[PDB]
Nucleic acid binder design. Structure first.
Lengths: 266, 422
RNA sequence: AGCAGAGUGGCGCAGCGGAAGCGUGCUGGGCCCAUAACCCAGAGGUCGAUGGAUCGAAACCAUCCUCUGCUACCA
């Protein structure tokens, strides 16, 4: 099966291969980022140095990113190169690999819920759903994953395209297991100083309403790591707008404690 | 509760833990322990229960027989009487000071607010025994003198060595008499001779006469927090100051002021300091409920301060007066003083030295330990027994009081002299 | 309590969402008249527990434990 919109890689595209044979002209390898077809790596494009013979930096059974130098359009010879390549391209391809893995892992369960003897089953799912997601956005490395992540959290993709009666379960499971929890490492910097005596009760009031628009209690997470430090993970679910909740909450707490003979920053 | 504060002061090397466990059956501890290869140089805390069974012996918790420990190979024995329900006489409190000669300033602070002491004298080291005498002399000056000496070892120590030592001590102490109550040589290595000590310590040792019907003054020496996180049970009924009362009586619900004060905004002048006010929540000792704090006793005064201020050792000697009383807020103060006729703190058999302490001289910075506070000040006028000192942070003069004066002899402070504020 | 690492497959670092990867060391072979250098070949193997997706989890993501590191620290 393919793993990309076309079954034909483009010329000068970043790809992935899996080393499986070593030729007298280089190394014959299968592609695993488009359709699985033969591509020849050349032993004159391995590096621009002294090759006193390696099967311990380039070896069989390893996925390796490489760049398609040429393609013979109707003969299907995908010439490959590592002569001009960078680590950055590898990162970009790794991203596409990981996204393809998660989408295909959801869409493999679907294919095992069906009984088939036609290779084209996965292709049928791909053409209708994948393309309209990916053609618009796939240059940063995106695929169907953005659409799927949006779909579980706000239905609008399962109302525009077909919904299978077993896709949904697996879709929910892989998104909610792997990307819930899902994550921040925000901290509220809070220190307490009191030389009065009513500071103890003052802090409690300040914590419970460190932001307005609450019933009387906020849904913040207070944490005591040490006695003066009150760490507040604010707007906790995933946090995408609780930066202002975090920042301004620190000002409240610092003012309330300052009245009870504290001295704090303005 | 605490009724008498007995101190376990001594000096470098002779075992604190071995002797204290022989007499009381109590071991002292301070967090971040560490249990040493010498004596307890930690600021240990401990209370203890003093019982009678109407025997010449004093019960432990195990009041029929009591097996001590200092080695597991042997089985040490102590006598706790023969049983028929053991009667609580009172709850006593101890003050484990950090040992060694160098810790003199802290020993002074603690001494100045503890009623009595148990001077752990050695025998396996130096014959004139410098520090024992040093301690005794300071004690007789402050106003106390009912001390009961315990000679830690006599088993390892040969009787010739111990005899030469007894001569040299009795000849050095020709000017200091503060050991006119008995001197009990004991074993602590074998944990024996305990029984005559048990009759003695309830008889010879009350609180040496003190004035507790005057005005409440509390001196905090040890810091305690409190309690259990949280978070939100938290915020606390709060932070506990381990202090002893040396004058007056603190009752529950009193407001108390910590009197060195905090200085008014900006330091460009030198006047004035304003005391900080906290109400007493509770008067807690041992694991037994109370609502009182018997004076001449070490009491946990819970005040509404936060854990952070007592997280470790942070208070070593602050003077607290209650309430609406006015100590004078001098910035320049007239000290009377006198010096020791020996330089005592470090001594060798090379005879270096016992020469009289060198006088004070103007434009020199000197440590005035006033109360249990230790503030620094420079001498502006210098007459022999009347110097005028200008202090860095203002000084509350409670009463005519006492002071302790120390000198950096050659690399650390050593006690040189005393005097009185005027 | 908060944070970090590990619970090896010889060592050390632990690679990533398709399994010891790399360097080193050990063991064996080759090269040369011989040794170094140099080139190959090794080696029983869910990698602490409780869970979930999984074709699989030291490594995809949680809940825990233990041993230690940092912050600290109730004691």
């Amino acid at each position: 099966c393919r793993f990309y919109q076309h079954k034909f890689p483009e010329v000068e595209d970043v790809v992935m291969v899996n080393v499986r044979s070593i030729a007298e002209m280089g190394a014959y390898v299968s592609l695993l980022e488009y359709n699985n077809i033969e591509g020849m790596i050349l032993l004159s494009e391995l590096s621009r140095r002294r090759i006193r013979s390696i099967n311990k930096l380039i070896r069989i059974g390893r996925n390796e990113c490489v760049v398609v130098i040429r393609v013979d359009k109707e003969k299907g010879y995908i010439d490959l190169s590592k002569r001009r390549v960078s680590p950055e391209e590898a990162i970009k391809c790794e991203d596409k690999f990981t996204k393809s893995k998660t989408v295909y892992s959801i869409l493999r369960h679907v294919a095992e819920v069906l009984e088939y003897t036609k290779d084209e089953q996965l292709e049928s799912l791909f053409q209708r759903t994948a393309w309209v997601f990916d053609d618009k956005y796939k240059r940063p490395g995106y695929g169907a994953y953005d659409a799927f992540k949006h779909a579980v959290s706000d239905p609008s993709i399962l109302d525009s395209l077909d919904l299978n009666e077993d896709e949904r379960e697996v879709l929910i499971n892989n998104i909610n297991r792997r990307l819930t929890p899902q994550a921040v490492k925000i901290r509220a910097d809070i220190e307490v100083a009191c030389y009065g005596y009513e500071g103890i009760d003052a802090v409690k009031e300040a914590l419970r309403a460190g932001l307005n628009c609450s019933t009387e209690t906020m849904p913040i997470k207070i944490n005591l790591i040490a006695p003066p430090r009150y760490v507040m993970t604010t707007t906790t679910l995933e946090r995408t707008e609780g930066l202002s909740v975090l920042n301004q909450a620190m000002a409240v707490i610092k003012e309330k404690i300052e009245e009870k003979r504290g001295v704090f920053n303005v | 509760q605490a009724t008498i504060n007995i101190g376990t002061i001594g000096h470098v090397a002779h075992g604190k833990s071995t002797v204290v466990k022989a007499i009381s059956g109590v071991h002292t501890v301070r967090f971040k322990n560490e249990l040493e290869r010498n004596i307890t140089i930690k600021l240990g805390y401990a209370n203890a229960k003093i019982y009678k069974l109407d025997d010449p012996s004093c019960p432990r918790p195990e009041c029929y027989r009591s097996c001590g420990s200092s080695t597991p190979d042997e089985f040490p024995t102590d006598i706790p009487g023969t049983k028929g329900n053991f009667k609580l006489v009172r709850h006593v409190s101890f003050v484990d000071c950090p040992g060694h000669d160098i810790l003199m300033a802290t020993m002074l602070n603690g001494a100045a607010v503890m009623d009595a002491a148990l001077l752990l004298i050695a025998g396996n080291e130096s014959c004139p025994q410098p520090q024992t005498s040093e301690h005794l002399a300071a004690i007789e000056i402050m106003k106390l003198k009912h001390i009961l000496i315990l000679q830690n070892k006599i088993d390892l120590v040969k009787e010739s060595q111990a005899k030469e030592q007894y001569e040299q001590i009795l000849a050095f102490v020709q000017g200091t008499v503060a050991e006119g109550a008995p001197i009990i040589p004991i074993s602590a290595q074998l944990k024996y001779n305990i029984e005559v000590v048990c009759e003695y310590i309830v008889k010879k040792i009350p609180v040496p006469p003190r004035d507790f019907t005057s005005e409440p003054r509390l001196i905090v020496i040890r810091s305690f927090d409190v309690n259990k996180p949280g978070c939100e049970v938290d915020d606390l009924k709060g932070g506990v100051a381990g202090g002893s009362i040396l004058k007056g009586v603190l009752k529950v619900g009193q407001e108390i002021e910590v009197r060195p004060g905090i200085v008014s905004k900006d330091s460009e002048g030198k006047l004035m300091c304003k005391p900080i006010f906290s109400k007493i929540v509770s008067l807690f000792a041992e694991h037994n409920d109370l609502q009182y704090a018997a004076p001449g006793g070490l009491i946990g005064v819970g005040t509404k301060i936060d854990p952070t201020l007592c997280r470790a050792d942070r208070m070593v000697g602050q003077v607290l007066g209650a309430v609406g009383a006015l100590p004078e807020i001098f910035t320049e103060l007239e000290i009377s003083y006198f010096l020791l006729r020996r330089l005592l703190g470090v001594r060798t058999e090379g005879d270096k030295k016992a020469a009289k302490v060198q006088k004070l001289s103007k434009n020199e910075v000197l440590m005035v330990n006033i109360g249990s506070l230790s503030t620094g000040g420079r001498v502006s006028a210098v007459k022999a027994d009347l110097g005028k000192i200008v202090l860095t942070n203002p000084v509350c003069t409670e009463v005519g009081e006492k002071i302790a004066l120390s000198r950096r002899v050659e690399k650390h402070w050593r006690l040189i002299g005393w005097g009185q504020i005027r």
